[PDB]
Amino acid sequence: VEKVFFVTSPIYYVNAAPHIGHVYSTLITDVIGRYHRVKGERVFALTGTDEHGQKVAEAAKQKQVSPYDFTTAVAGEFKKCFEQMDYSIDYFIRTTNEQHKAVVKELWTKLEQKGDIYLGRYEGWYSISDESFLTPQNITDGVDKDGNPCKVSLESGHVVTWVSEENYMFRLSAFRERLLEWYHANPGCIVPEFRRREVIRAVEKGLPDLSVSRARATLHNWAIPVPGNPDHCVYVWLDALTNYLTGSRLRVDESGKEVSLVDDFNELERFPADVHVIGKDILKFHAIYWPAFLLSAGLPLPKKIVAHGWWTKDRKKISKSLGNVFDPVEKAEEFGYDALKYFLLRESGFSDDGDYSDKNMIARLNGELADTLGNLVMRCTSAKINVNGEWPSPAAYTEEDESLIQLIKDLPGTADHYYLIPDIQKAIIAVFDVLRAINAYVTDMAPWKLVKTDPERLRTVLYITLEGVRVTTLLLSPILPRKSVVIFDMLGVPEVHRKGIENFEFGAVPPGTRLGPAVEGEVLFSKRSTE
Numbered sequence: 183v184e185k186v187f188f189v190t191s192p193i194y195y196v197n198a199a200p201h202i203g204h205v206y207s208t209l210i211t212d213v214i215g216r217y218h219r220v221k222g223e224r225v226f227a228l229t230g231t232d233e234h235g236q237k238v239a240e241a242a243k244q245k246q247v248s249p250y251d252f253t254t255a256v257a258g259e260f261k262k263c264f265e266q267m268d269y270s271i272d273y274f275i276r277t278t279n280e281q282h283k284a285v286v287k288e289l290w291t292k293l294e295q296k297g298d299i300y301l302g303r304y305e306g307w308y309s310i311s312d313e314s315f316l317t318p319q320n321i322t323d324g325v326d327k328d329g330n331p332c333k334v335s336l337e338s339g340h341v342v343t344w345v346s347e348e349n350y351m352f353r354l355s356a357f358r359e360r361l362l363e364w365y366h367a368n369p370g371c372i373v374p375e376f377r378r379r380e381v382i383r384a385v386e387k388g389l390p391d392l393s394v395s396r397a398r399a400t401l402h403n404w405a406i407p408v409p410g411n412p413d414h415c416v417y418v419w420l421d422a423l424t425n426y427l428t429g430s431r432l433r434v435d436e437s438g439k440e441v442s443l444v445d446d447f448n449e450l451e452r453f454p455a456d457v458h459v460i461g462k463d464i465l466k467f468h469a470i471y472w473p474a475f476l477l478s479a480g481l482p483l484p485k486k487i488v489a490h491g492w493w494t495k496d497r498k499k500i501s502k503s504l505g506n507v508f509d510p511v512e513k514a515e516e517f518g519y520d521a522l523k524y525f526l527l528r529e530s531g532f533s534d535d536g537d538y539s540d541k542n543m544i545a546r547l548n549g550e551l552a553d554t555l556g557n558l559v560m561r562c563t564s565a566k567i568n569v570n571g572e573w574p575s576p577a578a579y580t581e582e583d584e585s586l587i588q589l590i591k592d593l594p595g596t597a598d599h600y601y602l603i604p605d606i607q608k609a610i611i612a613v614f615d616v617l618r619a620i621n622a623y624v625t626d627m628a629p630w631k632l633v634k635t636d637p638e639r640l641r642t643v644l645y646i647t648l649e650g651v652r653v654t655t656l657l658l659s660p661i662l663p664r665k666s667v668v669i670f671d672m673l674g675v676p677e678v679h680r681k682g683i684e685n686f687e688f689g690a691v692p693p694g695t696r697l698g699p700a701v702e703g704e705v706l707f708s709k710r711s712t713e
């Protein structure tokens with residue numbers, strides 16, 4: 183099917199200011215979107231904020247201010263942060279949006295009409311901080327803010343509380359068999375593979391029904407009322423997950439402001455998501471609850487859920503209270519935006535919990551960005567080596583030349599598959615494997631010596647080098663968006679050849695193309711003092 187490629191991040195609780203976790207989730211979403219735009223596809227990338235619920239409402243009361251004023255303020259901080267991070271998100275959704283609210287009521291009514299919502303009770307544990315229902319197998323003993331003994335989530339360590347309430351219940355138990363069919367029939371639907379196995383095991387063990395409303399008082403009336411029953415509010419998670427459907431149905435103007443909500447998602451050709459980017463903490467909501475609601479409502483299921491891991495700094499938990507911070511905008515101003523994005527995407531795979539340190543960040547910046555990529559770009563554009571400031575016409579290729587050309591020809595296919603898993607780390611590693619091979623080749627051929635000794639041979643070496651850089655840069659462009667433009671400028675690559683699968687082919691830029699102009703002190707990535 184030809185269709186708008188639809189990629190999403192979670193929508194983030196606005197109980198607190200934005201931080202690395204949010205920036206990372208949205209980065210992954212942004213990169214996936216950027217790559218598909220580079221392939222020439224229509225892309226709609228979504229992010230935003232989750233603004234209802236007890237968690238948020240009680241965060242606002244702690245700051246002694248109105249929930250409307252509080253959410254709007256913090257939502258503005260999330261936007262400012264994402265603007266500063268230089269993402270290419272198509273829309274920023276807020277669950278306070280009135281059009282979103284209409285979609286929630288619409289979905290709720292669909293589930294009710296389908297017979298999958300009934301009036302029951304939940305008597306059990308709840309984590310307000312995770313807005314999550316827990317069974318007694320998932321709590322243990324712990325300590326609250328005071329120091330008193332209490333119960334806490336095994337999953338997250340936050341304080342749990344006992345809830346006994348007459349609630350509207352969704353028949354999640356009735357979807358066990360169909361969810362299992364879905365997971366089996368689509369073995370690529372959850373990534374990485376071990377989290378897919380985690381989900382299957384959980385659903386195999388059995389599913390209870392899920393409380394999809396709460397009494398209005400306990401949410402401090404900060405939620406969407408249940409259609410036909412003003413005494414109840416919709417479960418913040420059913421509300422939240424619906425953002426993906428809302429987003430798929432919003433027409434957005436040039437400025438990024440929402441202007442219209444269509445009736446039928448087919449109208450905008452986005453739904454269902456091709457990739458839901460999420461953190462491991464919220465897997466069950468997306469891989470169990472979400473598809474169950476969609477199945478009930480007769481809506482199509484997402485194609486892929488990708489769940490990444492948690493971050494630490496110097497092998498310690500990131501926390502303002504513990505005295506170990508990681509401000510992304512600060513580190514970006516220190517080391518560069520593209521470089522910081524490279525590091526976060528390179529350093530950790532989705533299977534792992536990543537670890538920043540200034541030491542490791544400087545090693546990759548110097549080692550990979552400067553010594554490997556940057557050094558190569560300067561060499562093939564140098565007036566000392568490339569004396570006519572153009573793309574030369576290659577002479578006959580040696581077997582060594584062709585071994586390199588082969589790697590470059592194969593790179594797009596390989597990087598493509600990795601981006602579609604998606605596994606951004608492996609894609610980056612693949613591109614840099616080819617970059618290391620180009621450097622070895624250049625070291626081997628010594629083009630600086632060829633300038634005087636064998637100009638005809640230099641044409642070949644120089645042409646292959648320029649073309650390897652172009653291709654490696656194109657495939658890295660979703661990761662180093664600003665620097666890829668500088669590189670393409672330096673190579674003098676026309677705009678048209680900077681996107682499209684056509685330009686994945688070796689030899690897309692013709693000989694005689696003139697390099698862009700030099701600058702007296704310019705350099706792509708500057709080496710940082712080794713500390």
Ligand code: MET
Pocket residue numbers: 191192193194195232422423425464
């Ligand atoms: C449907 S994505 C909701 C994510 C949730 N607000 C969180 O921050 O974990």
